Design a protein around this ligand. Sequence first.
Ligand SMILES: N[C@@H](Cc1c[nH]c2c(Br)cc(Br)cc12)C(=O)O
Ligand SMILES: N[C@@H](Cc1c[nH]c2c(Br)cc(Br)cc12)C(=O)O
Ligand SMILES: [Fe+3]
Ligand SMILES: [Fe+3]
Ligand SMILES: [Fe+3]
Ligand SMILES: [Fe+3]
Ligand SMILES: [Fe+3]
Lengths: 236, 244
Amino acid sequence: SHMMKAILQLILEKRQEFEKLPCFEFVRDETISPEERLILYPCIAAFALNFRDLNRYDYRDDNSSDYYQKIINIHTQEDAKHWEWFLNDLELLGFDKTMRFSEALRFVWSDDLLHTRRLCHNIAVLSHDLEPVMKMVVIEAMETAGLVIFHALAKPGESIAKATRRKYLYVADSHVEVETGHNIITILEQTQLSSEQEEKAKEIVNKVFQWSTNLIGEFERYVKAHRSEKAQPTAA
Amino acid sequence: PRGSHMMKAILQLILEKRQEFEKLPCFEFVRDETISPEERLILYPCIAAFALNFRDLNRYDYRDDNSSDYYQKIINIHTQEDAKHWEWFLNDLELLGFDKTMRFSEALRFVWSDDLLHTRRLCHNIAVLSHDLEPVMKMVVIEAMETAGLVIFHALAKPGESIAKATRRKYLYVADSHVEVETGHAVGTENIITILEQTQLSSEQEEKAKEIVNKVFQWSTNLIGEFERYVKAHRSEKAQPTAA
Ligand SMILES: N[C@@H](Cc1c[nH]c2c(Br)cc(Br)cc12)C(=O)O
Ligand SMILES: N[C@@H](Cc1c[nH]c2c(Br)cc(Br)cc12)C(=O)O
Ligand SMILES: [Fe+3]
Ligand SMILES: [Fe+3]
Ligand SMILES: [Fe+3]
Ligand SMILES: [Fe+3]
Ligand SMILES: [Fe+3]
């Protein structure tokens, strides 16, 4: 059992199962119009800005002298910028519609977006008392699940971007390329964990992908319940 | 000291923090009847970053319907009442003229504004603090949170009831009825403070209880500071209630 080969293999095993979820088969289906495949886009509003705060305030610790924490801090500086990309594509896709303040509040805190809204909350609770090397396991599992989601979402996104000649930033290949280079993974490959640390790392990987699966399930149920609320992008 | 005396100190510490919390300048502003009540409730939209997070805190973080600990069952009952008040907030939001029409992204940018950081993360910090606590320690979190909340809504009810009387409208969040519900407890349930009064704490429990009380009131103080800075930065965005 060399080093953290078992933990990294567990992440790869969870990733292959996560990739086969029915919501991703729907998003990758080029026989369906990309505007209908991005019906789930407004659901990300309950996550994208919570993810910003997760990287700003929960992962990050600008006062610590730990070298592993400083590498985490640099990693969070990049991920904390992507919320503006979400709001950019929100307007481009025609989902930045006008509404009452309370209607926006009821949408974000809707019971149908519970798992989406509480994903970053659960991650922060899990990672509050972890040592920096254990925080990296949380981040690495989170980055792996996110790359799966945006590798699929970029397919209808780039189709709309090309057809409308607009520059998309969130559901786009440029977002995927930044996430692909997400070094934390090099430290994990060279880190030896104790028996207690390895058991905790397995729990981390299981919880992250279980919570991510719950979020994807909410995305699929939203598409079924809002099958007519397709994206409405404009051409340039 | 004695286990009953170590707990007595914690409950006295909550009262000591409450007396200091009551003297914050934001509360002197809200209680000043020489200032228009519409201007004293300028801070009301700031509560949008808290009220619905507080609902989820009571729904999912405090509550645990699978445990057989009777203290946990009393916590669950207590959270069922507090988890209903978010609808009162949205009720008064519309009455005060703060439920304005806007872009979806503009509502998102408001809730996650950096000027509402401490307001938005208060329930988050409470949930992180209360995740691994035993039920009796969770009651200390709840009791401190309820004490700080009562201070805030005792003050907010003064301009709220003035507007309710002048406009003949039924307010539910910034109203005396909200304060009375928080002061009273559910029928047939045992008071949380009474259970705490009869609880003997260990030396380790007293150390955690002091940290809990200090953190809850410090985070509440940070939220109030954001409310005061918001009023100064948005002095013209007064409430606009309508009459009957
Ligand atoms: N690239 C994502 C980060 C991310 C990381 N993990 C994610 C999961 Br699981 C679901 C969703 Br929706 C997003 C993510 C972002 O910038 O918001
Ligand atoms: N009675 C409040 C609960 C509450 C409890 N503690 C609070 C603090 Br500290 C700040 C604010 Br704003 C609200 C609260 C409510 O129903 O939302
Ligand atoms: Fe990203
Ligand atoms: Fe990333
Ligand atoms: Fe309340
Ligand atoms: Fe209460
Ligand atoms: Fe109470």
